[PDB]
């Protein structure tokens, strides 16, 4: 029986309701606390023992590896030139992304209004962004916006009511008068608040999200299987990097579509809020031991972005295809983790350290150990994504009645350069899994 | 499809036949920019810049619940959605085509880019090439091209005949909001310089700039087949932003490999000529490069570089003789812009480059239909055999970037087909 992603998602759809279990310890999380930004984790030694901002220490190891003809830690490349090309590809992938993740809200690519964008100015005479909506039916809007999402480069798209618990209490950002070359040295915190205002707006003191901002649209941006399996080496960094620029194009494309439909839209990429939680509530997949959203189509080998809007939409249903029960007995990522950051124990409500948000049932991982391995290996690792059985494209079987997971799955870089590739690193042998008709965009 | 292309490979050599009259072409001559063709009346009779008259028609259609010229939409909401999708698709494109060289997204050096600054400590762009082998480099840069969103990619030696003699651009310090009012003409010249450079007077391409990399960027068949209505505009627009992201992605990669790279999108030179010389496809009667995978329903962009590379072979799979007897685009063209006669060396008007053997088309008649229809037409692309209502499109099949899984296997690539 030919693999049917729409059948699979229908079979495992849940009934409405956020699936994330929480208790009263839960409060919104200040984005400064992520290991990338918090002062307790931000500094790491390089290979000479010099303590630097982690990404500068990682740079030192990238340079070292190229000079020694390596594609990763102790991993010899075919020659220096191949070591060079992998890092060149990686660096180029980030072309449309600011400071590793586009996290500063209402700066650069992440503008909360379209009014200053070159494309909005060019189209101003048509007035699409000033004309009131001609569609208010959530059903038709869900079909329109999901079609646009797919055009905008999403391999998966889902809708959920916006749960403010996952919105950062305060954002990391920079002052509006600071130019790019100073951005890394002038980062600040700024509260994200919800107020009774008509449009998203930023004051000197606050990022203000309107109380009418009802919905969140979550996009899955698929990474390349062959490149990710080279984790923690350079080609895994490259597919990661290219997908961040894909995320950026997505947010901007979709926000402009939403505005031109007569609503407002907030982009985010890696900022504003926690993408895994939004993705779970929008039904893209389930939370996992490693901490990522695992999807039926790609496993965890998919990046996430999201857009916030007041456009009426029909929320999608959450999905339960057994990931919690497989993670409970699998532990492959925990055992392969080069830094031992992923726990082998049970889910709790108690954060392991400042980097976890306490008050939600989840596997609690030590994300400072994880970041610690990035300067050491000179990349973004990804070994956990690479070894997860759900990242295999072969995991689904049909028994003549229904779909199930094959339990048997839970029991070099020259060839990547020389081997299969296709547009955006997508795989034509699986590209049918994300074909979409109206019946699977809205019900 | 990888076997079809080698089956139809020609011997080396540009397949574009020229005579002793051919001269490089001033970009200002195109119908989009030339003063003889730039102004067009709107439906009220008011004479305006053509795209502004076209705006007026889009507004009138939305108010009247139309997806195109006297093409009724399901309702006003649907009419609004098509135009909203078209407008959004242009987000990463400056003034319809990114033609101004070394401006906005089309920077001829990576040095001021945020990505380059962030990565400056690694020094990939300052470091001499570690690979000078054109065979390895051709495999690397084509892999990168596919990552960067190209559905097709080819290499050719740079034929300077198809580089514009003078570019349309703006002065460097002019803010975006004045750009449309302050466009100027600027010579593109080749000189013995290390790097691509712009002075007050000239865009200077180095004489070392040996090669051009041509990308094909596939458009959605269902959407294009609504030409000349709004969904054909939307797939046109979205692919222009894909072109821009391709140019920047690939230029950055080529720069981080130790070479220089010039983006262009719709600027700098004539895409169709470059695509034929790079083996992507064959010139056609409508004027487009017809490819075996997509026919003409594919956009083009290109990057120029001194990176050593193995040129591809031009391809002959019978387009010229098929166009010789087909004439379907000529008969369907709403403006009678496409000729039904033979190919000549003599342009029909100022918008053609004379001196090369091609079907000569009147591109001002084409442009005139765009304000009238409120779109970018595309009927020729839609009806062309090689290429094979709006509610059903909005309700029907779609996939990432508007690509089609029933055909996506045809652009799978391995090293054997890359070099
Ligand atoms: O998710 C991320 C964020 C930063 C970096 Cl360098 C890599 C991946
Ligand atoms: O090729 C082009 C150029 C400009 C426009 Cl408006 C549409 C298509
Ligand atoms: S490797 Fe196993 S335990 Fe880890 S996320 Fe994947 S399925 Fe869950
Ligand atoms: S990215 Fe690497 S270090 Fe981090 S949790 Fe995954 S396997 Fe461990
Ligand atoms: S775009 Fe339309 S008007 Fe122009 S040549 Fe093609 S069919 Fe004719
Ligand atoms: S419609 Fe016919 S004549 Fe026109 S370009 Fe296509 S094949 Fe050639």
Numbering used by the authors:
A (entry chain A): 3 to 413, 431 to 462
B (entry chain B): 7 to 394, 431 to 461
What are the paper's exact sentences on this?
However, only a dozen of the corresponding gene products were biochemically characterized including the tetrachloroethene RDase (PceA) of the epsilonproteobacterium Sulfurospirillum multivorans. PceA was described to mediate the reductive dehalogenation of chlorinated and brominated ethenes or propenes. The crystal structure of PceA showed the norpseudo-B12 non-covalently bound in its ‘base-off’ conformation deeply inside the protein. The two [4Fe–4S] clusters of PceA connect the surface and cobamide cofactor at distances short enough to allow intramolecular electron transfer to the active site and potentially also from the proximal Fe–S cluster to the substrate.
PceA dehalogenated 4-iodophenol (4-IP) three times faster than 4-BP, while 4-chlorophenol (4-CP) was not converted. The position and orientation of the analogues 4-CP, 4-BP and 4-IP in the active site of substrate–enzyme complexes is thereby identical, independent of the type of halogen. It has to be concluded that exclusively the differences in the energy of the various carbon–halogen bonds determine the displacement or continuance of the substituent.
